[PDB]
Coordinates of C-alpha atoms and ligand atoms in Angstrom, one line a residue:
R8 CA -12.5 -63.7 2.4
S9 CA -11.1 -63.4 5.7
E10 CA -14.7 -62.8 7.9
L11 CA -13.0 -61.3 11.8
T12 CA -15.9 -63.2 13.9
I13 CA -16.2 -59.5 16.2
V14 CA -19.1 -58.9 18.8
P15 CA -19.0 -55.7 20.4
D16 CA -22.7 -55.7 21.6
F17 CA -25.4 -58.5 22.3
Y18 CA -29.0 -57.9 21.0
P19 CA -32.0 -60.0 21.1
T20 CA -31.9 -59.6 16.8
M21 CA -30.5 -57.3 14.2
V22 CA -31.7 -54.8 13.2
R23 CA -30.3 -52.6 10.3
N24 CA -29.1 -49.2 11.1
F25 CA -25.5 -48.1 10.8
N26 CA -26.7 -43.8 11.6
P27 CA -23.9 -43.1 13.5
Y28 CA -25.9 -40.2 15.2
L29 CA -29.1 -42.3 16.8
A30 CA -28.2 -44.5 20.0
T31 CA -30.1 -47.9 18.6
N32 CA -28.1 -48.2 15.4
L33 CA -25.3 -51.7 14.8
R34 CA -22.0 -50.7 17.5
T35 CA -20.2 -51.9 13.8
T36 CA -21.4 -47.7 12.3
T37 CA -18.3 -45.8 14.0
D38 CA -14.9 -46.2 13.0
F39 CA -15.7 -49.2 10.3
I40 CA -18.0 -47.1 8.6
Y41 CA -17.1 -43.9 9.1
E42 CA -14.1 -42.5 10.5
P43 CA -12.6 -40.1 12.3
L44 CA -10.3 -36.9 10.6
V45 CA -7.9 -38.6 13.7
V46 CA -8.0 -41.3 16.4
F47 CA -6.5 -40.2 20.1
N48 CA -4.3 -43.4 21.3
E49 CA -5.8 -42.4 24.8
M50 CA -2.8 -45.4 26.3
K51 CA 0.2 -43.1 24.1
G52 CA -0.8 -40.6 26.0
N53 CA -3.5 -39.2 23.9
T54 CA -1.8 -39.3 21.1
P55 CA -2.9 -38.1 17.7
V56 CA -2.9 -40.6 14.4
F57 CA -4.3 -38.8 11.7
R58 CA -6.8 -40.4 9.3
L59 CA -9.1 -39.0 7.4
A60 CA -7.1 -35.3 8.4
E61 CA -3.2 -35.0 7.4
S62 CA -2.5 -32.3 10.1
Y63 CA -4.3 -29.9 12.5
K64 CA -3.2 -26.6 14.0
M65 CA -4.3 -24.7 17.1
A66 CA -5.0 -20.8 16.8
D67 CA -2.6 -19.5 19.2
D68 CA -5.1 -18.2 21.8
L69 CA -6.4 -21.3 21.7
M70 CA -10.4 -19.9 19.9
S71 CA -9.9 -21.9 17.1
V72 CA -8.7 -24.8 15.3
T73 CA -8.1 -25.5 11.4
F74 CA -8.4 -29.6 10.1
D75 CA -5.6 -30.5 7.3
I76 CA -8.1 -32.5 5.1
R77 CA -6.1 -35.9 3.3
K78 CA -6.3 -35.8 0.2
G79 CA -7.5 -39.0 -2.6
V80 CA -9.6 -40.0 0.3
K81 CA -13.1 -41.6 -1.0
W82 CA -16.0 -42.4 0.6
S83 CA -17.3 -46.2 -0.8
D84 CA -19.5 -44.9 -3.2
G85 CA -16.0 -43.1 -4.8
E86 CA -16.7 -39.4 -4.7
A87 CA -13.7 -37.4 -2.9
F88 CA -14.0 -36.3 1.1
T89 CA -14.4 -33.5 1.8
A90 CA -14.2 -30.4 3.7
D91 CA -17.9 -30.2 2.3
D92 CA -18.3 -33.2 4.9
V93 CA -16.9 -32.1 8.0
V94 CA -19.2 -28.5 7.4
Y95 CA -22.0 -30.7 6.3
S96 CA -21.9 -32.8 10.0
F97 CA -21.1 -30.3 11.5
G98 CA -24.4 -27.8 10.7
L99 CA -26.8 -31.1 10.6
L100 CA -25.8 -31.9 14.6
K101 CA -26.0 -28.4 15.5
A102 CA -29.7 -27.9 13.8
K103 CA -30.7 -31.6 15.2
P104 CA -29.2 -31.0 18.0
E105 CA -30.4 -34.9 18.6
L106 CA -28.4 -36.3 16.9
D107 CA -25.7 -34.7 18.9
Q108 CA -24.5 -37.6 21.0
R109 CA -21.6 -36.2 22.7
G110 CA -23.0 -31.9 23.5
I111 CA -20.1 -31.0 20.5
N112 CA -22.6 -27.4 20.2
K113 CA -21.1 -26.3 22.9
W114 CA -17.5 -26.3 22.4
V115 CA -17.9 -25.3 18.2
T116 CA -20.0 -22.5 17.6
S117 CA -18.9 -22.2 13.8
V118 CA -17.1 -24.4 11.2
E119 CA -15.5 -22.7 8.0
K120 CA -15.3 -24.5 4.4
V121 CA -10.6 -22.3 3.7
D122 CA -10.8 -24.7 1.0
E123 CA -11.8 -28.1 -0.1
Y124 CA -9.0 -30.4 2.2
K125 CA -9.1 -27.3 5.4
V126 CA -11.5 -26.1 7.9
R127 CA -11.4 -24.6 10.4
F128 CA -13.3 -25.0 13.6
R129 CA -14.4 -21.6 15.8
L130 CA -14.9 -23.0 19.4
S131 CA -16.8 -21.4 22.6
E132 CA -13.8 -21.5 24.7
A133 CA -10.1 -21.1 24.6
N134 CA -10.1 -25.1 25.5
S135 CA -7.4 -26.7 23.8
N136 CA -9.2 -30.6 24.5
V137 CA -12.0 -29.6 21.8
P138 CA -10.0 -30.6 18.8
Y139 CA -10.1 -34.7 21.3
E140 CA -13.6 -33.8 20.9
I141 CA -13.8 -33.1 17.2
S142 CA -12.6 -36.7 17.2
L143 CA -15.0 -38.8 18.1
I144 CA -18.1 -36.4 15.9
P145 CA -18.9 -39.1 13.2
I146 CA -18.2 -37.2 9.5
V147 CA -21.1 -38.4 7.0
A148 CA -21.8 -38.1 3.4
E149 CA -22.6 -35.0 2.5
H150 CA -23.3 -35.6 -0.6
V151 CA -25.8 -38.7 0.4
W152 CA -27.2 -36.2 3.7
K153 CA -28.4 -33.3 1.6
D154 CA -30.4 -35.5 0.2
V155 CA -32.1 -37.4 2.9
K156 CA -35.8 -36.7 4.2
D157 CA -35.2 -36.5 8.0
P158 CA -31.8 -37.5 9.3
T159 CA -33.0 -38.4 12.7
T160 CA -35.1 -41.2 11.9
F161 CA -32.8 -42.4 9.0
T162 CA -32.2 -46.0 8.8
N163 CA -29.2 -45.3 7.0
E164 CA -29.7 -48.5 6.1
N165 CA -27.5 -48.8 2.5
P166 CA -24.1 -46.9 3.9
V167 CA -21.3 -44.7 1.7
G168 CA -18.5 -44.0 4.3
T169 CA -14.8 -43.7 3.9
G170 CA -13.9 -46.2 6.8
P171 CA -12.7 -49.9 6.7
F172 CA -16.0 -52.3 6.4
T173 CA -18.4 -50.6 4.8
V174 CA -20.4 -53.0 2.0
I175 CA -22.9 -54.9 3.7
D176 CA -23.4 -58.1 2.1
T177 CA -25.5 -60.4 4.1
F178 CA -27.4 -59.0 6.6
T179 CA -30.4 -61.6 8.8
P180 CA -31.8 -61.4 11.8
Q181 CA -29.2 -63.7 13.3
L182 CA -25.8 -62.2 12.1
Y183 CA -24.8 -60.0 9.7
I184 CA -21.7 -59.8 7.3
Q185 CA -19.6 -56.1 6.4
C186 CA -16.9 -56.4 3.9
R187 CA -14.1 -53.9 2.6
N188 CA -14.7 -50.1 1.4
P189 CA -13.5 -51.0 -1.7
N190 CA -12.3 -47.8 -2.2
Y191 CA -10.3 -48.1 0.5
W192 CA -7.8 -44.9 1.2
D193 CA -6.5 -46.9 4.1
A194 CA -7.0 -50.3 1.5
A195 CA -3.0 -51.7 1.9
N196 CA -2.9 -51.9 5.4
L197 CA -6.0 -53.5 5.2
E198 CA -5.9 -57.3 5.1
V199 CA -9.2 -58.2 6.3
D200 CA -12.2 -58.6 4.5
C201 CA -15.3 -58.7 6.7
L202 CA -16.4 -58.5 9.7
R203 CA -18.3 -61.2 10.8
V204 CA -21.2 -59.9 13.2
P205 CA -23.4 -63.0 15.1
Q206 CA -25.9 -62.3 16.9
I207 CA -25.7 -63.1 21.1
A208 CA -28.3 -62.7 23.4
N209 CA -26.3 -62.9 26.4
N210 CA -23.2 -63.4 28.0
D211 CA -24.2 -67.0 29.3
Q212 CA -24.1 -67.9 25.0
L213 CA -21.4 -65.2 24.3
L214 CA -19.9 -68.1 26.7
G215 CA -20.2 -71.4 25.4
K216 CA -19.1 -69.2 21.8
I217 CA -15.7 -68.0 22.7
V218 CA -14.7 -71.5 24.6
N219 CA -15.5 -73.9 21.6
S220 CA -12.5 -71.0 19.9
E221 CA -15.9 -69.4 17.3
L222 CA -15.3 -66.0 18.3
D223 CA -12.2 -64.0 16.9
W224 CA -12.6 -60.3 18.9
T225 CA -14.9 -59.8 22.4
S226 CA -14.9 -57.4 25.0
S227 CA -16.9 -59.4 27.6
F228 CA -16.6 -61.2 30.7
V229 CA -15.8 -64.5 31.0
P230 CA -16.0 -66.3 34.4
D231 CA -13.0 -68.8 35.5
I232 CA -11.1 -67.4 32.4
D233 CA -7.7 -68.9 32.1
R234 CA -9.2 -73.0 33.8
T235 CA -12.0 -72.5 30.6
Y236 CA -10.8 -70.2 28.2
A237 CA -6.7 -69.3 28.2
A238 CA -5.0 -72.3 29.6
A239 CA -7.7 -74.6 27.2
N240 CA -5.9 -73.5 24.2
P241 CA -2.8 -72.0 23.3
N242 CA -4.8 -69.1 20.8
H243 CA -7.5 -68.5 23.1
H244 CA -5.7 -65.1 25.1
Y245 CA -6.9 -61.6 26.8
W246 CA -5.3 -58.8 27.7
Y247 CA -7.3 -56.8 30.8
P248 CA -5.6 -52.9 30.3
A249 CA -6.3 -50.2 33.3
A250 CA -9.4 -48.7 33.2
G251 CA -10.7 -46.0 35.6
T252 CA -9.0 -44.9 38.7
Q253 CA -11.2 -46.5 41.7
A254 CA -10.2 -45.1 45.9
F255 CA -11.5 -44.5 49.3
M256 CA -11.7 -40.9 50.2
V257 CA -10.7 -39.7 53.3
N258 CA -12.4 -36.9 54.6
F259 CA -9.6 -34.0 55.4
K260 CA -12.2 -31.7 57.3
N261 CA -13.8 -34.6 59.5
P262 CA -15.8 -33.2 62.5
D263 CA -14.9 -34.8 64.8
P264 CA -11.7 -33.4 66.1
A265 CA -9.9 -37.4 66.8
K266 CA -11.1 -38.5 63.5
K267 CA -9.4 -35.3 62.2
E268 CA -6.2 -36.7 63.5
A269 CA -6.4 -39.2 61.9
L270 CA -7.4 -38.5 58.6
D271 CA -5.5 -35.3 58.4
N272 CA -2.1 -37.0 58.6
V273 CA -0.4 -38.1 55.7
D274 CA 1.3 -40.8 58.2
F275 CA -2.1 -42.4 58.8
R276 CA -3.3 -41.7 55.2
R277 CA -0.4 -44.0 54.2
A278 CA -0.6 -46.1 56.5
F279 CA -4.3 -46.7 56.1
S280 CA -3.1 -47.5 52.4
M281 CA -0.3 -50.0 53.0
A282 CA -3.0 -52.2 55.4
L283 CA -4.5 -52.6 52.4
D284 CA -3.8 -55.4 50.0
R285 CA -5.8 -54.6 46.1
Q286 CA -5.4 -57.9 44.6
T287 CA -7.3 -59.7 46.7
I288 CA -9.8 -56.8 46.0
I289 CA -9.9 -56.9 42.4
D290 CA -10.3 -60.7 42.8
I291 CA -12.5 -60.8 44.9
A292 CA -14.9 -57.8 44.5
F293 CA -14.7 -57.4 41.2
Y294 CA -14.3 -60.8 40.2
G295 CA -10.5 -60.1 39.2
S296 CA -11.6 -57.6 36.4
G297 CA -8.8 -54.6 37.3
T298 CA -5.2 -54.0 37.8
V299 CA -4.0 -52.2 41.1
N300 CA -4.1 -48.4 41.6
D301 CA -0.2 -48.1 43.4
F302 CA 0.5 -44.1 42.4
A303 CA -0.5 -41.9 45.8
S304 CA -1.8 -39.5 43.2
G305 CA -4.6 -42.0 42.0
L306 CA -3.3 -42.0 37.9
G307 CA -3.2 -45.3 37.7
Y308 CA -1.7 -47.8 35.1
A309 CA -4.4 -46.5 32.8
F310 CA -2.4 -43.4 32.0
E311 CA 1.3 -44.5 32.7
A312 CA 3.0 -42.0 29.6
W313 CA 1.9 -40.1 31.7
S314 CA 3.6 -40.6 35.1
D315 CA 6.8 -39.2 36.1
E316 CA 8.3 -42.2 37.8
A317 CA 10.4 -41.0 40.1
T318 CA 7.4 -39.2 41.5
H319 CA 5.5 -42.9 41.4
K320 CA 8.4 -44.5 42.5
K321 CA 9.2 -42.4 45.3
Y322 CA 5.6 -42.8 47.2
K323 CA 4.3 -46.4 45.9
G324 CA 5.6 -48.5 48.6
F325 CA 3.2 -45.8 50.3
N326 CA 0.9 -47.9 48.3
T327 CA 1.9 -51.8 48.2
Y328 CA 0.1 -54.3 50.5
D329 CA 2.5 -54.4 53.0
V330 CA 1.3 -54.8 56.1
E331 CA 3.8 -54.7 59.2
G332 CA 5.8 -51.2 57.4
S333 CA 1.7 -49.8 58.1
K334 CA 2.4 -51.1 61.7
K335 CA 6.0 -49.7 61.5
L336 CA 5.1 -46.3 60.5
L337 CA 0.9 -46.1 61.9
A338 CA 4.0 -46.6 65.9
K339 CA 6.4 -44.5 64.2
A340 CA 3.6 -42.2 64.0
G341 CA 2.6 -42.0 67.5
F342 CA -0.9 -44.1 66.2
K343 CA -0.1 -46.8 69.2
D344 CA -2.6 -49.9 71.0
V345 CA -2.3 -47.2 74.3
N346 CA -4.9 -49.4 76.5
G347 CA -4.4 -53.1 75.1
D348 CA -7.8 -53.3 73.5
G349 CA -6.2 -54.1 70.1
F350 CA -6.7 -51.0 68.2
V351 CA -4.7 -47.7 68.0
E352 CA -6.1 -44.5 69.4
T353 CA -4.4 -40.9 68.3
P354 CA -1.2 -39.6 69.2
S355 CA -3.1 -37.5 71.7
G356 CA -4.7 -41.1 72.8
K357 CA -7.9 -40.8 71.6
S358 CA -10.2 -43.7 70.8
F359 CA -11.4 -44.2 67.4
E360 CA -13.6 -45.5 64.9
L361 CA -13.4 -44.5 61.0
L362 CA -17.0 -45.3 59.3
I363 CA -16.4 -46.4 55.7
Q364 CA -19.2 -46.0 53.5
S365 CA -20.5 -47.8 50.0
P366 CA -23.8 -47.2 48.6
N367 CA -26.9 -50.0 49.2
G368 CA -26.9 -52.5 47.0
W369 CA -23.6 -51.5 45.2
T370 CA -22.3 -55.1 45.6
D371 CA -19.2 -54.4 44.8
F372 CA -18.0 -50.9 46.4
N373 CA -19.4 -53.0 49.8
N374 CA -17.6 -56.4 49.4
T375 CA -14.4 -53.7 48.6
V376 CA -15.1 -52.2 52.4
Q377 CA -15.6 -54.8 53.9
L378 CA -12.6 -56.7 52.8
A379 CA -10.7 -53.1 53.8
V380 CA -12.2 -53.1 57.0
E381 CA -11.0 -57.1 57.3
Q382 CA -7.3 -55.5 56.4
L383 CA -7.6 -51.8 58.4
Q384 CA -8.4 -54.5 62.0
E385 CA -4.8 -56.4 60.4
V386 CA -2.7 -53.3 61.4
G387 CA -5.2 -52.3 64.1
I388 CA -7.0 -49.7 62.8
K389 CA -10.6 -49.6 63.6
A390 CA -13.1 -49.6 61.1
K391 CA -17.0 -50.8 60.5
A392 CA -18.6 -51.2 57.0
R393 CA -21.9 -48.5 56.6
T394 CA -24.1 -49.0 53.4
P395 CA -26.6 -46.0 53.3
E396 CA -29.1 -45.7 49.7
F397 CA -27.2 -43.8 47.6
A398 CA -28.7 -40.6 47.8
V399 CA -27.1 -40.3 52.5
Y400 CA -23.9 -42.0 50.6
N401 CA -23.7 -38.6 48.9
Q402 CA -24.9 -36.3 51.4
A403 CA -22.5 -37.2 53.8
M404 CA -20.1 -36.4 51.6
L405 CA -22.0 -33.3 50.5
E406 CA -22.5 -32.0 53.2
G407 CA -19.3 -33.2 54.6
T408 CA -19.5 -35.5 57.6
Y409 CA -18.4 -38.6 56.4
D410 CA -15.2 -40.2 57.2
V411 CA -14.1 -42.6 54.9
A412 CA -15.9 -43.7 51.5
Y413 CA -15.3 -46.2 48.1
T414 CA -16.1 -44.1 45.3
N415 CA -15.7 -45.1 41.1
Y416 CA -14.9 -41.6 39.3
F417 CA -15.3 -40.3 35.9
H418 CA -14.2 -41.6 32.5
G419 CA -11.4 -40.0 30.7
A420 CA -9.0 -39.4 27.8
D421 CA -6.2 -38.1 29.8
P422 CA -5.5 -37.9 33.4
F423 CA -8.0 -34.4 33.7
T424 CA -11.1 -35.4 33.6
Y425 CA -10.2 -38.1 36.9
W426 CA -7.6 -35.3 38.4
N427 CA -9.7 -32.8 37.9
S428 CA -13.2 -34.0 39.2
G429 CA -11.8 -35.7 41.7
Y430 CA -9.3 -33.3 43.6
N431 CA -9.7 -29.1 42.1
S432 CA -11.6 -27.2 45.2
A433 CA -13.9 -25.4 43.1
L434 CA -16.1 -28.4 42.3
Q435 CA -16.0 -28.2 46.7
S436 CA -19.0 -25.9 47.0
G437 CA -21.6 -25.0 44.4
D438 CA -25.0 -26.0 43.8
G439 CA -25.1 -29.4 42.2
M440 CA -22.1 -30.7 42.5
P441 CA -21.2 -34.3 42.6
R442 CA -19.3 -35.9 45.1
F443 CA -15.9 -35.9 43.9
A444 CA -13.7 -33.9 45.0
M445 CA -15.3 -33.9 48.7
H446 CA -12.2 -35.1 50.9
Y447 CA -11.5 -31.1 51.0
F448 CA -8.6 -30.5 50.9
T449 CA -8.0 -27.6 49.5
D450 CA -4.6 -26.6 47.0
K451 CA -4.6 -23.6 45.9
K452 CA -1.2 -24.5 43.4
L453 CA -2.8 -27.7 42.5
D454 CA -6.0 -25.7 40.8
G455 CA -4.3 -23.6 39.1
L456 CA -2.2 -25.9 37.6
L457 CA -5.9 -27.5 37.1
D458 CA -7.3 -24.5 35.1
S459 CA -3.8 -24.5 33.3
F460 CA -4.4 -27.7 31.3
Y461 CA -6.0 -27.7 28.3
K462 CA -5.4 -23.5 27.7
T463 CA -1.3 -24.7 26.4
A464 CA -1.8 -26.7 22.7
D465 CA 2.1 -27.8 24.0
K466 CA 2.3 -31.7 24.9
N467 CA 5.5 -31.0 26.9
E468 CA 3.8 -27.9 29.1
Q469 CA 0.8 -30.2 29.2
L470 CA 3.0 -33.4 30.7
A471 CA 5.0 -30.7 32.9
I472 CA 1.5 -29.6 34.9
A473 CA 0.6 -32.9 34.4
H474 CA 3.7 -34.2 36.1
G475 CA 3.1 -31.1 39.0
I476 CA -0.3 -32.1 39.9
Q477 CA 1.7 -36.0 40.4
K478 CA 4.2 -34.2 42.2
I479 CA 1.1 -32.6 44.9
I480 CA -1.4 -34.7 45.2
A481 CA 1.0 -37.6 45.8
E482 CA 3.4 -36.2 48.1
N483 CA -0.4 -35.2 50.4
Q484 CA -1.2 -38.2 50.2
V485 CA -4.5 -37.1 49.1
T486 CA -6.7 -40.5 48.9
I487 CA -6.0 -43.6 48.6
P488 CA -6.5 -45.8 45.3
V489 CA -7.1 -48.8 45.2
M490 CA -7.5 -50.5 41.6
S491 CA -8.4 -49.2 38.0
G492 CA -10.9 -50.4 35.6
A493 CA -10.4 -53.7 33.5
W494 CA -10.8 -52.8 29.2
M495 CA -12.3 -56.0 28.5
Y496 CA -10.9 -58.3 25.6
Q497 CA -10.0 -61.5 24.7
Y498 CA -8.7 -62.2 21.1
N499 CA -8.3 -65.8 19.1
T500 CA -5.4 -66.5 17.3
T501 CA -6.7 -69.2 15.2
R502 CA -7.3 -67.3 12.6
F503 CA -5.8 -63.8 13.1
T504 CA -2.4 -62.5 14.5
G505 CA -1.5 -58.9 14.5
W506 CA -3.4 -58.3 17.8
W507 CA -2.8 -56.2 20.6
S508 CA -1.7 -57.7 23.9
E509 CA 0.3 -57.2 27.2
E510 CA 3.6 -58.3 24.8
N511 CA 2.3 -55.8 22.2
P512 CA 0.3 -53.1 24.3
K513 CA -0.4 -50.0 21.4
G514 CA -3.9 -49.2 23.0
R515 CA -7.2 -49.7 24.5
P516 CA -8.2 -53.5 22.7
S517 CA -12.0 -53.7 23.8
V518 CA -14.4 -53.7 20.2
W519 CA -16.8 -51.8 22.1
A520 CA -18.5 -49.5 19.8
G521 CA -16.6 -45.8 21.8
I522 CA -13.2 -46.7 22.0
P523 CA -12.5 -45.0 18.5
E524 CA -8.6 -47.1 19.1
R525 CA -10.5 -50.3 17.3
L526 CA -9.9 -49.3 14.0
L527 CA -6.8 -49.2 13.8
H528 CA -6.2 -52.0 15.6
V529 CA -8.3 -54.2 13.3
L530 CA -5.5 -52.2 10.8
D531 CA -3.2 -54.0 12.4
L532 CA -4.4 -57.6 12.2
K533 CA -3.2 -60.2 9.2
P534 CA -5.0 -63.7 8.4
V535 CA -3.2 -66.4 9.6
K536 CA -4.4 -67.5 5.9
Ligands
MG601 MG1 -6.0 -48.9 72.0

C-alpha cells in the first residue's frame, strides 16, 4: 500500500482524539476525516470546489443560502450522507457553543432540512461571505453523534467520516497511520492509500528527517534550505507562495506640520517606497519566508487572481527597489537637501526626521525597521528606529501621534479582510478599534466600495468592486507595502508525484490543519510505484 508521510503539527506524543470540534484534536481530522460541503480555493480567487455539496445558491436578498447535497455519498460505515448530518452538526454547535470554534453561530440563525439532499441556512445578516464561513464548519455523522453522551469530551477515537482517510490502521505514541475510507465517494480520485503520521517533537527533529528524505509533505521552517535540502536531492522541493501583507503605515494626520508636509504627499510616499529593498528585508529579517509585495494597493501576490493588472503595472515601479528613481522623484517633488547635511528638507525648507516604530521584542519587525532606516538614508530621508512596548506602539497609532509604523494585518480568504481592516474609515474611530486603519487617510467612495463587497453574490460584480478599491488605494500610495508572508511547504517526489508547485500552482500547498485545500492537494498525488 502507498503511505504518504505528513507532518501537519508537532506533538510530544500522539493522543487519540479525532473530535473535529476540539482544539486538542489531531491535526488530520478536518478535511481528511470530515470532508466539507465545498472547498474554497482561496489562491484561485476563492472559487468554490464542490465536494459533499454539488451546488449552492444565495437568496436574492442574501438572507439565506441553500446547499444541494450530492446524492450517493456514504459515511465510512456505509450509511448515506444526507441533509440530516448538516442540520445535526449546526444544531450541535448552536447547543454547545464551546464547540463552535469559528463563531458560525453569529452568522447562521437557523438551518432547515428542505429535503433529504437539500439544506437551507438562514443568516443573521445580508452577507455573501457566509457560504465561505459555512464551508469551514466540520459536518459529523448524525447517526453516530446522536448517541454520544457528551460531545464536548468525546474523543471520537473510532471516527466515522466522509473524507478520504478514516481508518485508524495503527495508533502508537510515536506514530499513527490513517488509511483510506473504504466507502469514499471520490475513491477513484484517491490514489494515496494511507497517511503516515510520525510523532515529531520540534523543528530540529523535523530538520534531521527532512534532509534524509524521510518525509513527503511538510510545512515547516527549514534553515539553509537551498544548500541542505533542495539542492541535495533532485526529489527535494519547496514552494512558498505569498500569504499575508506587511507594510509601513504613515500617519496622514501627523500633528507636526513639517512631517505632514512629507507624509501627506503622494510623491514622497512613492519615493519612500522606492528606497526600500524588499527582497533583502525578506531574506534578512524574515529568514527568506516571504514574497515581495510590489502592489501599491497592498493587494499582494496572495490575491493576484483579484488584481487588475493594468493598475498593478501602472504603479509597480513606485514599489520596486530603485534608489536612483527615489532620489529623482524626491527632487522632482521639491524635497531637496538645501543645507547640504545629506538629508532632504520639505519643499518649504523644513528639516524633519521620521520616527519609525515597531513593537519591542518583535525581532523580525525590529530588524525590518532598522533595514528600512538604512535604506531611507541612502536616498536622503532621515529616519530613526523606535521600539516602544506594544501598548505604547498601539496607543501612538490610536491617538494619531506616530509618524510611521511597521505592521502586519489579519489573514483572509480574499482581499476584503486586508482592505477593510486596513482602510475602512469607519475603523479609524471608536472604542476598541485596532491599529490597522489608523493611517487616517479617508475616502468615502473607498468605504462605500468596501461596504458593498459582500452585498452581492455576483463574482463579476465583486471583481469590479475589488478593481475600484485597488485603483483608489494604488493611485494614492496610501501605505508602503513591503512583503507577503509564506505558505510554508516542502515536498518530496521520491515516492509520490502530482504535487502543487510554482510550476503547478493549483492552490495553497501547506499541510496544516486549517488549509481546506489540502484535501484537493492529496487527491492530486500519485504513488511512484
Ligand atoms: Mg538637508
